[PDB]
Design a binder for this molecule. Structure first.
Ligand SMILES: Cc1cc2nc3c(=O)[nH]c(=O)nc-3n(C[C@H](O)[C@H](O)[C@H](O)COP(=O)(O)OP(=O)(O)OC[C@H]3O[C@@H](n4cnc5c(N)ncnc54)[C@H](O)[C@@H]3O)c2cc1C
Ligand SMILES: Cc1cc2nc3c(=O)[nH]c(=O)nc-3n(C[C@H](O)[C@H](O)[C@H](O)COP(=O)(O)OP(=O)(O)OC[C@H]3O[C@@H](n4cnc5c(N)ncnc54)[C@H](O)[C@@H]3O)c2cc1C
Ligand SMILES: [Ca+2]
Lengths: 391, 391
């Protein structure tokens, strides 16, 4: 009930922070609203930036990703009826990404926290965060009709976009930047080995599509769809038909069809909240900012926030310096606004906007041509996709 | 009344083509709707790409660029209260730009067309163009209720955005891409020395402003204004006061004030029409495409179209090959869509859009931070501003 850092949310951001604080001897308690089996079994794809992989390695939780993490070097941007394999490994001078599912990361982080005796309260939704300028902050929650409270020097808000920590900021201090895109992603799993080994984007004018490897025998496929789209309106035949039209090009093998599983719709939205700290409250991850998943930046941005947050807390407790805590939001926001810039730039380029001005629509092809066909375009994509530096 | 290439419009595009075809022994006739002095002094500003400068020198009309012109190595992007000098000379690996106004270019091309006996009919608006799919094309012009006619092998549509050649293509051929921006430019000429040795862009949240330098004595200044702004609503002191607010930064010399001579409101519009040819008609310059002047691309695009058109025509009359004429629209539209992309990107970054989504508006600063603060950002701006390859 008394700790140094109270961590709201046992997602990737919260578990990584608790793991980093434990190895530094800083005490922390994680409070999660969902059941432990629900957090682990929440499946989601995962493209990790190199900085994220190095962060997991150096924290002693990179053994499994170094064992089976699939190194990723290129994206096949398909448009104009042709392939455009952008080798961002070459274009970034040796930096790359790793295909490693997010549910594997949390499983690795949950194992590290469990092995480290990190207290994690599950099925205990936080109801209030108070005392942000008091001697100690108070995390009010309830487990099963019984209310609880964690007292802590600092509250790390790692409770995601729909958590409570962002709303716990003072109203006169918080400011939001919100943009919802007029489309969603229809995601499926296909029981068929992928056609090509590269992550493949269909960026033609019939709509956005994406093809990636979920496993050696399962393909992950996305289709741009209406924002409020019912997955029942998409039969298997319609899905494969639209997937063929948006992805197939001459000179490349046709799409591998198979039984479709796990049909779902995900939203597309850019949101950022300022500041990311006030008093004893520090926001990180989706609690402070979300991006359209086009650039695979959300989890990597969360890990970047935690990297800065963990170091600042170590400087406070271990070295008696509070200036790094005071610059947490400042440094995280600089990187995150460039991440927001990159995720939006990809989203507005590869998706079809209903009723969009025809000149702006044609600029999408012009942006695709320049990004893939010029050294400057390939350079900017490579450095952003593999991960911007962390301050 | 009979020539080889009938040129519609005596702007920089039409004059440059008439001179180039004359240097190679090809006969041409220019038909201008306005007076001679009106065309010469229509626009008293302009920045030239390096490729445009070399083209003028190799054509024999670029001897005055060293004296009258102003060579550029950097632009001072001012925002957030600070200067950000982007040295596009170093970033592009040696390429640069020149401040050489359009009224100086036209005077040079008028001299060459005069010194080479190029027939130019002024105050004779072209009314109709026919025979594009016949063995010979006809240009029907008029003057005081008097119809004239000019027969030619090919028609060069260089009559600008308000011209008639773009509408001369058969029904269903032409397709237009049009996007208007919700602001205009209030441009002035001032008898005041430049406050800094570099062309300065004011990317303020009050609106865009620019300080260009005609000479060490005169300054060219632009202000973002309402699209149909009444220049009468902008007194001298209001202009200087707003220019101070959008340009002055601490630590840099303040803007100098002086007598204001030129003053006018110009629109901000992106337009491009496809194709740039049909049979014996060939469009060049503003007749086929206009951009917002944010990136100094209109004239340079017109000179890029003429360089391809003059080469294809010389290849036709000298070697009997129409292969380059058949690919004129193909190659010109390839470069122009990248030029449209760069002109739109700068325009949507540096101007304030009323009622804009807050996230998108804040991305303007993110785009400004990346363009000036990263090697990848500077490289892309440098190569684009100094001029893309023409091919
Ligand atoms: C389809 C898709 C694909 C993606 N692909 C990628 C990719 O390739 N690469 C990448 O880097 N990112 C990717 N992302 C983004 C990434 O998944 C998210 O950014 C990431 O989940 C953020 O983690 P987080 O810990 O900050 O938030 P979350 O993962 O949402 O964790 C928040 C946790 O807090 C808990 N919680 C909520 N409210 C409370 C409360 N009141 N009290 C207590 N606990 C609470 C939640 O139950 C949850 O466990 C993708 C996202 C989507 C949707
Ligand atoms: C404020 C401003 C700043 C600019 N700055 C730059 C810059 O820095 N760099 C740059 O490269 N560009 C710049 N531009 C763009 C540049 O001025 C134009 O793109 C350029 O004038 C295009 O040349 P053109 O010959 O194709 O068209 P025009 O210059 O418009 O020539 C067309 C000619 O045809 C004539 N004509 C029209 N209709 C007919 C008809 N029916 N019959 C006969 N004749 C006809 C017109 O009278 C005119 O003389 C700027 C433009 C503006 C408005
Ligand atoms: Ca108290």
């Amino acid at each position: 009930m008394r700790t140094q850092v109270g961590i709201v949310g046992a997602g990737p951001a919260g578990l990584m922070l608790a793991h980093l604080l434990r190895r530094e001897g800083i005490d922390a308690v994680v409070i999660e609203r969902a059941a432990r089996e629900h957090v682990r079994t929440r499946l989601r794809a995962g493209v990790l930036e190199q900085g994220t992989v190095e962060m997991l390695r150096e924290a002693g939780v990179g053994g499994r990703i170094d064992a089976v993490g699939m190194e990723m070097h290129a994206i096949d941007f398909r448009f104009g009826g042709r392939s455009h394999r952008l080798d961002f490994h070459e274009a970034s001078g040796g930096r790359r990404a790793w295909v490693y599912p997010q549910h594997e990361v949390v499983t690795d982080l949950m194992s590290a926290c469990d092995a480290g005796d990190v207290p994690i309260l599950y099925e205990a939704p936080v109801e209030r965060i108070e005392g942000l300028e008091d001697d100690r902050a108070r995390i009010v929650f309830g487990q099963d009709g019984a209310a609880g409270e964690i007292t802590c020097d600092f509250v790390a808000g790692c409770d995601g976009f729909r958590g409570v920590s962002r709303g716990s900021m003072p109203a006169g201090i918080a400011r939001g930047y919100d943009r919802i895109y007029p489309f969603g992603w229809l995601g499926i799993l296909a029981d068929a080995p992928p056609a090509s080994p590269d992550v493949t984007w269909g960026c033609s004018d019939r709509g956005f599509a994406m093809m990636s490897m979920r496993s050696p025998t399962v393909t992950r496929l996305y289709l741009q769809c209406e924002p409020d789209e019912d997955p029942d309106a998409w039969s298997d035949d319609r899905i494969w038909s639209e997937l063929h039209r948006r992805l197939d090009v001459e000179g490349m093998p046709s799409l591998r069809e198979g039984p479709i599983r796990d049909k779902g719709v995900t939203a597309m939205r850019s949101f950022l909240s300022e500041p990311m700290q006030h008093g004893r409250l520090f926001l990180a991850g989706d609690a402070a900012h979300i991006v359209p998943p086009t650039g695979a930046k959300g989890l990597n941005s969360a890990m970047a926030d935690i990297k800065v947050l963990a170091a600042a807390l170590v400087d406070h407790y271990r070295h008696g310096r509070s200036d790094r805590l005071a610059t947490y939001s400042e440094r995280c926001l600089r990187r995150m606004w460039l991440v927001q810039r990159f995720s939006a730039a990809l989203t507005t380029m590869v998706h079809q906007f209903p009723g969009q001005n025809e000149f702006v629509r044609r600029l999408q092809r012009a942006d695709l041509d320049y990004m893939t066909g010029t050294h400057a375009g390939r350079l900017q994509f490579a450095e952003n996709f593999t991960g911007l530096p962390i301050e």
